[PDB]
Coordinates of C-alpha atoms and ligand atoms in Angstrom, one line a residue:
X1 CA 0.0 0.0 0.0
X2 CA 0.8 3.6 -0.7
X3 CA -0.4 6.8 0.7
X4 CA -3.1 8.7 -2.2
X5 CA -2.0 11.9 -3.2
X6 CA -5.8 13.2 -2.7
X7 CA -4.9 16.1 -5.3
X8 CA -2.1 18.2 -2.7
X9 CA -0.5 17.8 -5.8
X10 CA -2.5 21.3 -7.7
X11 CA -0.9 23.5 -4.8
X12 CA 3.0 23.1 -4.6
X13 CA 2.9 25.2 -1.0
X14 CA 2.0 22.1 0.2
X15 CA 4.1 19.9 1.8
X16 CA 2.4 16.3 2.2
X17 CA 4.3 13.3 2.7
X18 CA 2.8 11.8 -0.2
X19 CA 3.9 14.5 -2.6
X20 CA 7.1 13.9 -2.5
X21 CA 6.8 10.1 -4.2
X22 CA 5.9 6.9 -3.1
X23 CA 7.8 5.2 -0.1
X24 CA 10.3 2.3 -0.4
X25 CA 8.2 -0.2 1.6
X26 CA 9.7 -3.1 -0.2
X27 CA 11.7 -4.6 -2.4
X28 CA 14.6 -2.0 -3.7
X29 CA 13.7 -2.7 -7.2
X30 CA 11.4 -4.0 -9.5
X31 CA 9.6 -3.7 -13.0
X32 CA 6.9 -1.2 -13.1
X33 CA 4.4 0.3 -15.8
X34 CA 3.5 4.0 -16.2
X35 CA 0.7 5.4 -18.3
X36 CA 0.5 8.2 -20.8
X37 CA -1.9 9.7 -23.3
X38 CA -0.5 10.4 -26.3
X39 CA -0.1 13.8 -27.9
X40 CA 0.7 15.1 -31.2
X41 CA 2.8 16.4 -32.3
X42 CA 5.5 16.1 -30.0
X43 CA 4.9 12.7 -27.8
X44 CA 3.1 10.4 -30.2
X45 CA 5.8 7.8 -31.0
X46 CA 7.4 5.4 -28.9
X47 CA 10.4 7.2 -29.5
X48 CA 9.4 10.6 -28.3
X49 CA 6.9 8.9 -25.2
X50 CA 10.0 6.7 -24.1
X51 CA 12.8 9.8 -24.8
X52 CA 10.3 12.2 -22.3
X53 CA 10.1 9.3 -19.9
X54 CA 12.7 7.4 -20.1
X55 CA 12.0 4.3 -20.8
X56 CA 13.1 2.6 -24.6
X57 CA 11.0 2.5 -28.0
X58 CA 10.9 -1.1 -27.8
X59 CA 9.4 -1.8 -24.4
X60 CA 6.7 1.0 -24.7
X61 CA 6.1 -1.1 -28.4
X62 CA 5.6 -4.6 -27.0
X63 CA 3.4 -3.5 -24.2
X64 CA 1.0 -1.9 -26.5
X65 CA 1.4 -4.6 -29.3
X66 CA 2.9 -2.0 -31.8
X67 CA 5.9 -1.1 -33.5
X68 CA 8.4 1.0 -32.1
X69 CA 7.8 3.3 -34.7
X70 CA 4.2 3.3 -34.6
X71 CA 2.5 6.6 -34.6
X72 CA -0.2 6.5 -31.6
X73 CA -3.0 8.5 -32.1
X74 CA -4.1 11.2 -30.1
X75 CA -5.9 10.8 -26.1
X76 CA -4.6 6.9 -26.3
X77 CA -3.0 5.7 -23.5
X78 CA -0.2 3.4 -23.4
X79 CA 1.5 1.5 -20.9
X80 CA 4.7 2.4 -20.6
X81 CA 6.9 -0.3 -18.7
X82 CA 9.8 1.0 -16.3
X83 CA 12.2 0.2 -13.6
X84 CA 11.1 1.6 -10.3
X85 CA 14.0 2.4 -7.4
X86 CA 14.7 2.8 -4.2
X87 CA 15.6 6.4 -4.0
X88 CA 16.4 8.3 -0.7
X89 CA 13.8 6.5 0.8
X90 CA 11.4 7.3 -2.2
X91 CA 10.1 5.0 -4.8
X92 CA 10.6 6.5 -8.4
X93 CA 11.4 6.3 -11.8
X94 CA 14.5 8.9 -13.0
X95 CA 14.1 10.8 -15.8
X96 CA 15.2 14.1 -17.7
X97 CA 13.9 16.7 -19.1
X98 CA 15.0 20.2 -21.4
X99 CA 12.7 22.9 -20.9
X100 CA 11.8 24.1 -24.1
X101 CA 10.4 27.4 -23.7
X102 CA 11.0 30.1 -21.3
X103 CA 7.7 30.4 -19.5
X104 CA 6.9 26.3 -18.3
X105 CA 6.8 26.1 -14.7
X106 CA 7.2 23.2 -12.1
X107 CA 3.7 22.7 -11.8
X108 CA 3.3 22.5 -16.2
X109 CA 6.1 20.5 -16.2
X110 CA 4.2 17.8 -13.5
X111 CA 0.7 18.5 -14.5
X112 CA 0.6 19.5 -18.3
X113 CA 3.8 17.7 -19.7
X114 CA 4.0 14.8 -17.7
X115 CA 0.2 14.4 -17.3
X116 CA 1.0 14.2 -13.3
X117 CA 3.1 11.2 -13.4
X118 CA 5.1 13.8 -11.4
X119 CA 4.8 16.4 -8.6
X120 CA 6.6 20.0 -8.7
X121 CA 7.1 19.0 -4.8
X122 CA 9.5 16.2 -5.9
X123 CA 10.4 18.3 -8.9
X124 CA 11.3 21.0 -6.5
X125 CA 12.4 18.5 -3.9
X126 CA 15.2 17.4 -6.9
X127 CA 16.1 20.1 -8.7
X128 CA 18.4 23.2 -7.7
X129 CA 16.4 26.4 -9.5
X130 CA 14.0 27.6 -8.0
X131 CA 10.4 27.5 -8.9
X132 CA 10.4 31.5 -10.5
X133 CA 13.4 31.4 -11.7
X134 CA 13.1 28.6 -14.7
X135 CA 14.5 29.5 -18.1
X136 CA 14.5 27.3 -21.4
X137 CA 17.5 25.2 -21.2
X138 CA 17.3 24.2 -17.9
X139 CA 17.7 20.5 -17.3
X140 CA 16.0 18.5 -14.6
X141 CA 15.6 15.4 -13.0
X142 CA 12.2 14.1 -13.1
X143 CA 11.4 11.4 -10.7
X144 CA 8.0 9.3 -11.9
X145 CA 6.1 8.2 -9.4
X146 CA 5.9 4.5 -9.3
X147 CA 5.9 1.7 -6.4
X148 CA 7.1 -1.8 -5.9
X149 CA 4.4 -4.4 -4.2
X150 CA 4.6 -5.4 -0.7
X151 CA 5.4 -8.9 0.5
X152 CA 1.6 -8.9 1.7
X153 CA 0.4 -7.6 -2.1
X154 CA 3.0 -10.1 -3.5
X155 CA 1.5 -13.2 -1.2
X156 CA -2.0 -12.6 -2.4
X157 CA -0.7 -12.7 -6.3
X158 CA 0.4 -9.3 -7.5
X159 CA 3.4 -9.0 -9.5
X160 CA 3.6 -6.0 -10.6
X161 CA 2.2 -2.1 -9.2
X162 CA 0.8 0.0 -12.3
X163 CA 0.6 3.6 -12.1
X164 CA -2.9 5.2 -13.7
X165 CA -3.8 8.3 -15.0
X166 CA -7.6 8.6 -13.8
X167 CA -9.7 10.3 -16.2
X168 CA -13.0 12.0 -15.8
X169 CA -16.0 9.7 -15.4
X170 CA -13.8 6.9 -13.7
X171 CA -14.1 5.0 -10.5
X172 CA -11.8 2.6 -8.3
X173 CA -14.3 0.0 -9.6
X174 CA -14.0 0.8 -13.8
X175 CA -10.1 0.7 -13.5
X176 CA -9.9 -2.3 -11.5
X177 CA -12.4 -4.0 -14.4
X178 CA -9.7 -2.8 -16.9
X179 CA -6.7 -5.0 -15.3
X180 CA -9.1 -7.6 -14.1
X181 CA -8.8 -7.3 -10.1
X182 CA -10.5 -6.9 -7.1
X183 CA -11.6 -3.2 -6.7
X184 CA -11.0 -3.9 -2.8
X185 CA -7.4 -4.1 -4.3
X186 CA -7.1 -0.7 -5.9
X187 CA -8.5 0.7 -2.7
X188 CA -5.9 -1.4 -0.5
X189 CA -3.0 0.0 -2.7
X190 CA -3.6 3.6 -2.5
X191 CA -4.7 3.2 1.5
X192 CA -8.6 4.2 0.4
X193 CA -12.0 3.0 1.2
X194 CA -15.1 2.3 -0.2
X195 CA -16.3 5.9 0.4
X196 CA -13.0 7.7 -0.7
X197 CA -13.1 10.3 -3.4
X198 CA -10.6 10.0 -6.9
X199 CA -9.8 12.7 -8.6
X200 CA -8.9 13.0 -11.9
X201 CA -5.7 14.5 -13.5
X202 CA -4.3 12.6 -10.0
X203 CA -2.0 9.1 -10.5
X204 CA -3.5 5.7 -9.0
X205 CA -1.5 2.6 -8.2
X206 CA -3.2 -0.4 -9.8
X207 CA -1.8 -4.0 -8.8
X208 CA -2.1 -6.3 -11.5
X209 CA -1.6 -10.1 -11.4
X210 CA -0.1 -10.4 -14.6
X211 CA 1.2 -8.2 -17.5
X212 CA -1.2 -5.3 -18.6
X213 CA -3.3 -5.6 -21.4
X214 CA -2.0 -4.6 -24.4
X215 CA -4.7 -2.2 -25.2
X216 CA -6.5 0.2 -22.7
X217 CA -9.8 1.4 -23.7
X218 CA -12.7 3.1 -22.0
X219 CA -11.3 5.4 -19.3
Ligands
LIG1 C1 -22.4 8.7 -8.7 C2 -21.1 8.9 -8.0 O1 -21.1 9.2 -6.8 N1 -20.0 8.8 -8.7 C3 -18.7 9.0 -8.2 C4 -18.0 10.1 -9.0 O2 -18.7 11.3 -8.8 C5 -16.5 10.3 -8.6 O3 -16.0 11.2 -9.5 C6 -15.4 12.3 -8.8 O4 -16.3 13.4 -8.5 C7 -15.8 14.4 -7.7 C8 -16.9 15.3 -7.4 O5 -17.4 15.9 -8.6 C9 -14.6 15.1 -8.4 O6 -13.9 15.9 -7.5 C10 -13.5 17.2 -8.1 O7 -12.3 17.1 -8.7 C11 -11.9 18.3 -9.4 C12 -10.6 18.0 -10.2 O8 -9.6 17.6 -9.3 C13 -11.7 19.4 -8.3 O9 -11.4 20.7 -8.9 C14 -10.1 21.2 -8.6 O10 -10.2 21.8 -7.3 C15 -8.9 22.2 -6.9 C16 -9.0 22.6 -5.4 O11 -9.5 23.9 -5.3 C17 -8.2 23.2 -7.8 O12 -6.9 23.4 -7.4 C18 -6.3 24.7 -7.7 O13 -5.9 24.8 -9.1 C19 -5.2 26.0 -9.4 C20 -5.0 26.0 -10.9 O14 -6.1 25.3 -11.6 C21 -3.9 26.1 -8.7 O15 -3.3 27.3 -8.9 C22 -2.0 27.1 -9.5 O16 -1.0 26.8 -8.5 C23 0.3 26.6 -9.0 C24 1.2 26.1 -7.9 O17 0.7 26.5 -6.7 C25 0.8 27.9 -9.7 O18 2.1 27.7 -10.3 C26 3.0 28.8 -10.2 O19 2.6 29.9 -11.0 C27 3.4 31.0 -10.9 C28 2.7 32.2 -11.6 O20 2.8 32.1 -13.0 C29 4.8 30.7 -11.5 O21 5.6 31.8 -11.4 C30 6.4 32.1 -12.6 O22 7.4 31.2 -12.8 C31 8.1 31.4 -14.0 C32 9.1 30.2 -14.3 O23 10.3 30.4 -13.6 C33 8.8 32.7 -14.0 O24 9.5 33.0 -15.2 C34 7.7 33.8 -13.8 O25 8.3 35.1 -13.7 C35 6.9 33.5 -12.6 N2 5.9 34.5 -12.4 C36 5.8 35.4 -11.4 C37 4.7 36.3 -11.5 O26 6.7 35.5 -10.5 C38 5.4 29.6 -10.6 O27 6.6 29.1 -11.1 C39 4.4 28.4 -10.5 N3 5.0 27.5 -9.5 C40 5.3 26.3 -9.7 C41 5.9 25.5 -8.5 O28 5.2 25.7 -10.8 C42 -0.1 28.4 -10.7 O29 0.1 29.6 -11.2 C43 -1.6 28.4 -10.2 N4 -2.5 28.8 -11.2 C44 -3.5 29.7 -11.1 C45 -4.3 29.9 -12.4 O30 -3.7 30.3 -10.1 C46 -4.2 26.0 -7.2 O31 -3.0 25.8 -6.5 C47 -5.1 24.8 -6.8 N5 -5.5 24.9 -5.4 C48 -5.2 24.0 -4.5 C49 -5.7 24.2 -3.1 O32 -4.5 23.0 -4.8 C50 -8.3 22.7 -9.2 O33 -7.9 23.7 -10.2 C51 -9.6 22.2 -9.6 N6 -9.5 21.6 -10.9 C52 -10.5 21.5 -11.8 C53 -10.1 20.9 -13.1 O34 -11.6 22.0 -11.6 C54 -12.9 19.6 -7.5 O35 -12.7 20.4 -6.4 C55 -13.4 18.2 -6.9 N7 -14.7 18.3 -6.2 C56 -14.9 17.9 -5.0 C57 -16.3 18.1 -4.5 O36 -14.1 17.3 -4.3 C58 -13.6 14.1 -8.9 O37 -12.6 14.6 -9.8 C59 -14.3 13.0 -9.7 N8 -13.4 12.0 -10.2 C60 -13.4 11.5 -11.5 C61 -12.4 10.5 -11.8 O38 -14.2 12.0 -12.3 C62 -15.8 9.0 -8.5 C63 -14.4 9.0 -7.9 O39 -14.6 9.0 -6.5 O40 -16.5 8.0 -7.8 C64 -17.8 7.7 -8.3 O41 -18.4 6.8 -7.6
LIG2 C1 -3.7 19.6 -15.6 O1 -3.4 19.2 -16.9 C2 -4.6 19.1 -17.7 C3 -4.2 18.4 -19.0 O2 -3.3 17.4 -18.8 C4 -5.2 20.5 -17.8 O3 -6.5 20.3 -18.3 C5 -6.7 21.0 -19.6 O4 -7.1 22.3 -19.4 C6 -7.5 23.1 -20.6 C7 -8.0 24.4 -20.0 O5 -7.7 24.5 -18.6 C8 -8.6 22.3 -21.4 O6 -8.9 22.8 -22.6 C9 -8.0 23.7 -23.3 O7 -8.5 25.0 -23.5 C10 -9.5 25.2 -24.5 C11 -10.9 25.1 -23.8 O8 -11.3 23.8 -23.8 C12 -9.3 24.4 -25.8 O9 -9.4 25.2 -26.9 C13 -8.0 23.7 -25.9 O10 -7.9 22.7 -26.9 C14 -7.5 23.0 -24.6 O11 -7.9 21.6 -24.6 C15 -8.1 20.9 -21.6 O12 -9.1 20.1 -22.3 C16 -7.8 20.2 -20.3 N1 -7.3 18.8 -20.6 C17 -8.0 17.7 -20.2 C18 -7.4 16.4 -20.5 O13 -9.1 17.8 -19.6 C19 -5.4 21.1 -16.5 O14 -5.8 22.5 -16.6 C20 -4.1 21.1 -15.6 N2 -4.3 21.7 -14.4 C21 -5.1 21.3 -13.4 C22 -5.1 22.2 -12.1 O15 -5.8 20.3 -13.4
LIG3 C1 6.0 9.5 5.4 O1 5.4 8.2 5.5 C2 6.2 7.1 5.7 C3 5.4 5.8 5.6 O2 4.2 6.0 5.0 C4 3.2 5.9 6.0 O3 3.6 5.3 7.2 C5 2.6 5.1 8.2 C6 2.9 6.2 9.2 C7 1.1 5.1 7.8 O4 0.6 6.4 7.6 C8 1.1 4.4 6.4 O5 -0.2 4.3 5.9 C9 1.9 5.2 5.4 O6 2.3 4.4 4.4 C10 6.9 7.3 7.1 O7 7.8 6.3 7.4 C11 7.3 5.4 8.5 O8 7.4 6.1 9.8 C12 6.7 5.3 10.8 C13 6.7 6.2 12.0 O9 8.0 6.6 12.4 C14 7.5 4.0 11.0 O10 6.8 3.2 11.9 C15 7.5 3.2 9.7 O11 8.3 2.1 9.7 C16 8.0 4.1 8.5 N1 7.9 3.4 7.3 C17 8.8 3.5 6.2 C18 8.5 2.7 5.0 O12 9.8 4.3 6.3 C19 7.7 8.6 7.0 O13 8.4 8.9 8.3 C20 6.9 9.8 6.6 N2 7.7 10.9 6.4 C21 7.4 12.2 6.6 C22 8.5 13.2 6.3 O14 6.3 12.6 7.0
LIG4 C1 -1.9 -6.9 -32.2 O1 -3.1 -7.5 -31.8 C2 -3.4 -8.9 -31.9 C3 -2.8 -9.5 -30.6 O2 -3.2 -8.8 -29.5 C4 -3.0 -9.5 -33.2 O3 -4.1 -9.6 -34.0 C5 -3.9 -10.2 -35.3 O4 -3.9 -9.2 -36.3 C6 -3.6 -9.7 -37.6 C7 -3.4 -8.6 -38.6 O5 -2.4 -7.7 -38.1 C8 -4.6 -10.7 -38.1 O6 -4.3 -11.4 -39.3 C9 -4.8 -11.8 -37.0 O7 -5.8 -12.7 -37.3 C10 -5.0 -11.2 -35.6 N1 -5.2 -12.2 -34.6 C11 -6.0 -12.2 -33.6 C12 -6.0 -13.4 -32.7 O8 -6.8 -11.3 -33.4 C13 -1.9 -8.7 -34.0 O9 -1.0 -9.5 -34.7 C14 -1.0 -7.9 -33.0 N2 0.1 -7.3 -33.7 C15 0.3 -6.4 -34.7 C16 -0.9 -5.8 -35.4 O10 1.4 -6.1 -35.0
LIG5 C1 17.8 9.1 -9.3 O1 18.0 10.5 -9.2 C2 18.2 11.0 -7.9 C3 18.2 12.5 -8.0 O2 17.0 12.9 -8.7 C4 19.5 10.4 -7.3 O3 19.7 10.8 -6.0 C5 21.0 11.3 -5.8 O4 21.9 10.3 -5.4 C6 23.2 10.7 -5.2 C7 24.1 9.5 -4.9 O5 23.6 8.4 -5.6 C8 23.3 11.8 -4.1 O6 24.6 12.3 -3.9 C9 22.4 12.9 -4.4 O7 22.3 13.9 -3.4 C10 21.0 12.4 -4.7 N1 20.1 13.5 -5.0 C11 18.8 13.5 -4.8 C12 18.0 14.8 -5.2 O8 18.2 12.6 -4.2 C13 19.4 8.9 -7.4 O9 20.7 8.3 -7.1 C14 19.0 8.4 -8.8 N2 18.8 6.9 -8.8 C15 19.1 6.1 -9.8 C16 18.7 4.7 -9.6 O10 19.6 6.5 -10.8

């Protein structure tokens, strides 16, 4: 289990323990998947999905049963497997990122760019500028948040921890019918309850049993 972000993420004055990434709670590595809608004309290829975060053409293309060269088109979203890592007592991803035009901030960067498969806390957390005083050219280390199962989520079957990007209209009980689990187990993994709110624009952890379908569709 991980702690929800329960959007603190839309206000980087705040400080929550859960903005700053998952917590290493178990093993110190593992694979992982991430999500992403695609977006034209800059991140609709496996090449420019796995360049932003940082993954490899390949992997993105046999998880979604495409080429590596495939265009995706636009509002899909792929599965995007990575290595999650015990880092300073965080679970995360490392990636890298150019800012290409003067004017993006920490919170574009997390919510716009990266869909909110990052915080500007842990952006902030990681990175030396500070958060008015960005320019393009500036490089920083973007840590994706992802998570490794517990020894109690690995006993009852789960191999792997799948971050989600909740959409509009979705519930802890659609996206567990996507991956095929118990929606108990969605709630158990982000440490909510059968009356808990999701938000969307916010990340969820989804254990899966077995590798994720190739092809995610009503969200
Ligand atoms: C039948 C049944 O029951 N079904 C159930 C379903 O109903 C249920 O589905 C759920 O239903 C729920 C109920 O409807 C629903 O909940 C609602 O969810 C909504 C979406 O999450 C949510 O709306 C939220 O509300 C929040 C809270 O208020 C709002 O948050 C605010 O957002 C603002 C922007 O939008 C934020 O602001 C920005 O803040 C950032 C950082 O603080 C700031 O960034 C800085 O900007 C400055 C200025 O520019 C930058 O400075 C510049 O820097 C550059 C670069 O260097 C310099 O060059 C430049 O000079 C410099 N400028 C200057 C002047 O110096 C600076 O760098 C930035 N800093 C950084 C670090 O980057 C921005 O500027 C701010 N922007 C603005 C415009 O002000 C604000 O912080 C934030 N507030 C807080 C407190 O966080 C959201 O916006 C809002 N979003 C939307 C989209 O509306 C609702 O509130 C929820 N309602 C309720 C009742 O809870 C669920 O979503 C829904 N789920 C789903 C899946 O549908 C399901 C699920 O349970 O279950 C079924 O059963
Ligand atoms: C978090 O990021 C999301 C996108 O990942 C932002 O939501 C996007 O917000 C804009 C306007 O706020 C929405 O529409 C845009 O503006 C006009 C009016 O619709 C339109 O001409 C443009 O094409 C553009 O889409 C946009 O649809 C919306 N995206 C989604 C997926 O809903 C959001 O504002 C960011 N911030 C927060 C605090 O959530
Ligand atoms: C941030 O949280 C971690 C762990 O996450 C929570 O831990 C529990 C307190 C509970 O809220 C769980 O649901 C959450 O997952 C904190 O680390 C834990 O600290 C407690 C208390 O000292 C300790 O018993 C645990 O063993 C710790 N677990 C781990 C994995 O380190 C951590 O201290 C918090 N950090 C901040 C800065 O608030
Ligand atoms: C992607 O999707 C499925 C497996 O998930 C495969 O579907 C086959 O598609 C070809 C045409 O490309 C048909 O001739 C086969 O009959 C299909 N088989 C089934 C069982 O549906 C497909 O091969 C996969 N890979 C691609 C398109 O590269
Ligand atoms: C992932 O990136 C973080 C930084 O974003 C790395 O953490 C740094 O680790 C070195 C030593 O390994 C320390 O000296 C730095 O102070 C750390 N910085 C921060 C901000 O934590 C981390 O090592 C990277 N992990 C992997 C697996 O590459």
């Amino acid at each position: 289990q991980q702690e929800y972000l329960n959007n603190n993420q839309l206000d980087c004055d705040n400080t929550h323990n859960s903005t700053y990434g998952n917590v290493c709670n178990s093993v110190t590595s593992c694979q992982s998947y991430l999500t992403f809608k695609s977006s034209s004309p800059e991140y609709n290829t496996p090449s420019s999905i796995s360049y932003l975060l940082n993954s490899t053409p390949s992997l993105v293309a046999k998880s979604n049963n495409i080429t590596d060269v495939t265009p995706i088109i636009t509002d899909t979203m792929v599965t995007v497997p990575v290595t999650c890592s015990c880092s300073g007592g965080r679970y995360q991803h490392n990636a890298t990122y150019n800012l290409k035009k003067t004017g993006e901030t920490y919170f574009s960067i997390a919510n716009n760019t990266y869909q909110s498969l990052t915080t500007c806390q842990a952006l902030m957390a990681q990175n030396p500028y500070d958060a008015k005083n960005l320019f393009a050219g500036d490089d920083l280390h973007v840590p994706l948040r992802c998570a490794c199962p517990t020894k109690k989520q690995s006993d009852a079957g789960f191999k792997y921890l799948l971050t989600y990007l909740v959409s509009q209209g979705e519930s802890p009980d659609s996206i567990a019918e996507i991956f095929g689990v118990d929606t108990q187990s969605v709630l158990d993994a982000n440490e909510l309850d059968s009356k808990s709110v999701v938000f969307y624009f916010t990340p969820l952890l989804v254990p899966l049993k077995t590798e994720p379908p190739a092809r995610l569709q009503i969200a």
